[PDB]
Design a protein around this nucleic acid. Structure first.
Lengths: 31, 111, 56, 111, 167, 34, 118, 204
RNA sequence: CGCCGCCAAGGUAU
């Protein structure tokens, strides 16, 4: 209960930037 | 006149503003963070805007009393205006166009 | 006309006085015919008081 | 108190959400978030007022038509549960009886 | 020897903090530590050490009382972690916060007296214990900013006998 | 449906379901795990 | 005659706020919880228990007496009104007070007029 | 290698989302639900109850919703009533800071709890009726307090429950049967506040 | 107790 070692910014108490599939190129088309 | 009024029971200059919703907007900001759109919208290629508090929106001829007395034949009179619907889509551009929800068919334009 | 009218009654058999008004309907339930009194401080519930004796 | 209108607001709010989604031809929760909606016009966006994130109540359906049972079995509203806590409008609107009890003493002290 | 004793604890701070929070660039004060930081940051090669022309009066941070009683009464290298942007990020950015903070710190550096009395303009300028700055409205925020930059310009014009309006 | 209620049409309304339990209830004995 | 007295008062308040008090004042402060107990705080039935009537003592900045209690017009700068100041003027205070109130009204309507189609 | 944090962002970041859970979520059954469901550890309970106090203190005109959420806790777990009462005794004995509004919202806040109970009837041992030692905003704190508690209980049902409880003599509010000063000052006060529902003759 | 995942004809005439 509030040990004030504080652990970093977001730790005071998978969404957002989602990980790209590493095993994939996006199928590109020339519009 | 055909505009249906949801305010048949009041008007402000005799019984007053019976509600002042002002802090709901501020608590919406504090619930979604003060950077609620800056991480999403490209403010960085807007200009070099470091402050984002002096930012101001559409003011140029919004009411448009007498435009210039042209004819306004069919579609430019009664049809909807396309430029707010495209500037709003331009405003949330990296989070209407994000690369990693459907990572399949992408269609780059010419040049 | 009968179909667009609405009659209701509070008596010894009906413990409740219900009526509609001006778009939204309400009802009076007295304190005297409650075995256990309702909570009456949590929602759209607001109480009525007698001004001659200050009690609800 | 009216549960059937709290259901109707949740039904129609997500319906106008979907109507704005089909204007972009996206219909996606992750590509097209509700961060786009709940942002004021002064910072940019559309600007709307939440009543779906109110956690609409339920009751025992066997005894709902029979007897006032109290309050049991909260039901979720919108499909947004990542703990952003978008506030409700009514918590920043002054109620009826508070306004009347304030108005009586305000006019009494004014006289 | 303090220039060599500092960089070891700085590198221990870099090792203690997580990966996304360690810096890519460090702007030090006047140069005596480019080669000690260069030989102490061998475990983290991608950190740039630069000495710029932006000196900042953190010695004026020793003039405030919550830092002053903490720096004078200590029996351990406690390594405390405080915050100077108290409640500004909810209303303004970090840009206006920095442009306010360095002006108030420079005003406290050149004259602690009138920069101390300016930050309490009335007798209703209370400060909550978890913050160090007072809580006041935006008009008197920019009013305090204007009178503290007037303090700094007046101290410059008194020191070097320079007309303030002629600059 | 744990005991009595749920939603017969999750595709009609703009919700997904998952009725919770009222943690603000007051009675004597309710637990089964301790 | 009194502006230098005001300068002396603000300098002695300046000295007591600088040479003895810290940079930030807290909630307690050993001064503010005294002032909060010494507030007016209207809505107090105990006012007539200790006070007889709103009498007129020698309540003045100097030793000399002060004008009585009718209502003088306001003049934007709260004065030392005494010795028979009975409401004679050309009408410049009321005109610019109405001007500044009208300015505060038309900025409110101008924000409305600007925010219409946004 | 280890830090200390003398910035409390663990506190205020907590105090933000119970300003928020109860900003969202209409009525009081849902606010309590959401608050429970966040499993707040016990250390923080004094601060939670204090934040429920605070948030209520600032809404324009008072909303009965807070003496309902507040009560729902205040009789739910044993702790909330204890912590919460501590907030009262703590509260009156300052009450000179906030004034003329928050003072009213908080006063009615407590009157509402007492009336709906879910709070021991002896919180009043701290209220010191003096007229020497009461100060202003204290005095019109307790004014709107009783005067506003008046009609809920009505005068008689208050008059009794104030006194009839036998064990009542925990307080200095009314019972100061002491020197003919603060005794006379009680009578005068409650007659001025316009209740006079209890006045006696101790003057022999 | 945990909905929902979108293409095209509709316009730059024959």
């Amino acid at each position: 209960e509030d040990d004030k070692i504080y652990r970093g910014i977001n730790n005071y108490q998978r969404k957002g930037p989602i990980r790209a599939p590493e095993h994939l190129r996006a199928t590109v088309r020339w519009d | 006149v055909l505009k249906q009024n949801p305010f048949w029971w009041t008007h402000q200059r005799h019984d007053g503003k019976l509600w002042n919703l002002n802090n709901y907007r501020t608590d919406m900001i504090q619930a979604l963070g003060g950077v609620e759109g800056i991480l999403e919208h490209t403010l960085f290629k807007g200009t070099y805007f470091p402050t984002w508090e002096g930012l101001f929106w559409e003011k140029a001829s919004g009411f448009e009393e007498s435009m210039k007395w042209k004819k306004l034949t069919n579609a430019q009179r009664s049809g909807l205006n396309q430029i707010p619907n495209r500037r709003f889509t331009l405003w949330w551009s990296p989070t209407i166009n994000r690369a990693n929800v459907y990572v399949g068919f992408q269609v780059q334009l010419d040049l | 006309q009968w179909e667009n009218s609405f009659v209701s009654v509070y008596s010894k058999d009906n413990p409740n006085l219900l009526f509609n008004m001006c778009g939204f309907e309400c009802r009076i339930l007295p304190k005297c015919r409650t075995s256990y009194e309702e909570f009456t401080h949590k929602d759209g519930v607001w109480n009525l008081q007698n001004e001659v004796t200050k009690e609800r | 108190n009216t549960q059937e209108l709290l259901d109707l607001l949740v039904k129609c709010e997500n319906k106008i959400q979907t109507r704005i989604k089909i204007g972009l031809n996206s219909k996606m929760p992750s590509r097209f978030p509700p961060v786009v909606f709940y942002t004021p016009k002064e910072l940019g966006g559309l600007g709307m007022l939440s009543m779906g994130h109110v956690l609409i109540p339920q009751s025992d359906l066997r005894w709902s038509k029979q007897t006032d049972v109290g309050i049991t079995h909260f039901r979720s509203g919108m499909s947004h549960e990542e703990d952003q806590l978008i506030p409700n409008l009514y918590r920043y609107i002054q109620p009826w009886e508070s306004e009347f009890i304030d108005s009586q003493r305000v006019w009494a002290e004014y006289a | 020897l303090a220039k060599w004793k500092t960089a070891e604890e700085v590198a221990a701070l870099i090792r203690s903090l997580p990966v996304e929070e360690q810096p890519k660039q460090i702007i030090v004060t006047r140069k005596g530590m480019l080669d000690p930081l260069e030989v102490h940051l061998l475990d983290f090669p991608n950190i740039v050490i630069k000495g710029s022309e932006l000196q900042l009066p953190f010695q004026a941070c020793l003039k405030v009382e919550k830092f002053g009683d903490l720096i004078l009464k200590a029996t351990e290298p406690q390594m405390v972690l405080f915050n100077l942007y108290d409640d500004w990020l909810k209303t303004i950015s970090s840009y206006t916060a920095f442009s306010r903070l360095i002006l108030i710190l420079r005003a406290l550096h050149v004259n602690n007296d009138r920069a101390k009395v300016i930050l309490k303009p009335d007798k209703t300028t209370i400060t909550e214990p978890h913050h160090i700055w007072p809580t006041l409205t935006d008009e008197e925020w920019i009013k305090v900013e204007v009178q503290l930059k007037d303090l700094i310009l007046a101290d410059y014009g008194k020191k070097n006998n320079v007309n303030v309006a002629s600059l | 449906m744990y005991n009595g209620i749920g939603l017969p049409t999750p595709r009609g309304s703009g919700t997904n379901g998952y009725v919770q339990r009222n943690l603000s209830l007051v009675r004597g004995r309710r637990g089964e795990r301790p | 005659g009194l502006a230098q007295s005001r300068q002396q008062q603000q300098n002695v308040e300046d000295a007591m706020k600088e040479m003895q008090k810290p940079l930030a004042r807290y909630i307690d402060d050993e001064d503010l919880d005294r002032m909060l107990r010494e507030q007016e705080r209207e809505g107090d039935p105990m006012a007539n228990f200790i006070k007889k009537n709103k009498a007129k003592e020698n309540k003045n900045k100097k030793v000399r007496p002060r004008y009585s209690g009718p209502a003088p017009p306001p003049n934007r700068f709260w004065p030392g009104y005494r010795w028979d100041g009975v409401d004679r003027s050309n009408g410049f205070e009321q005109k610019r007070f109405a001007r500044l109130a009208s300015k505060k009204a038309v900025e409110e309507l101008a924000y409305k007029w600007s925010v219409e189609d946004m | 290698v280890t830090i200390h944090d003398k910035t409390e962002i663990n506190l205020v970041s907590f105090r933000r989302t119970i300003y928020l859970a109860i900003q969202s979520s209409l009525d009081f059954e849902e606010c309590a639900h959401k608050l429970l469901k966040m499993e707040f550890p016990e250390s923080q309970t004094k601060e939670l109850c204090n934040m429920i106090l605070d948030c209520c203190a600032q809404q324009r005109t008072y909303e009965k919703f807070f003496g309902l959420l507040a009560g729902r806790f205040c009789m739910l777990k044993k702790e909330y009533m204890e912590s919460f009462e501590g907030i009262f005794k703590e509260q009156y004995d300052t009450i000179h800071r906030l004034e003329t509004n928050k003072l009213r919202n908080v006063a009615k806040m407590f009157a509402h709890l007492l009336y709906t109970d879910s709070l021991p009837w002896s919180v009043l041992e701290c209220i010191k009726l003096s007229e020497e030692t009461t100060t202003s905003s204290s005095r019109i704190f307790v004014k709107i307090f009783f005067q506003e508690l008046c009609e809920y209980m009505g005068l008689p049902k208050l008059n009794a429950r104030l006194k009839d409880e036998t064990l009542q003599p925990f307080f200095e509010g009314l019972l100061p049967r002491d020197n003919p000063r603060n005794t006379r000052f009680a009578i005068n006060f409650f007659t001025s506040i316009g209740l006079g529902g209890l006045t006696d003759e101790l003057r022999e």
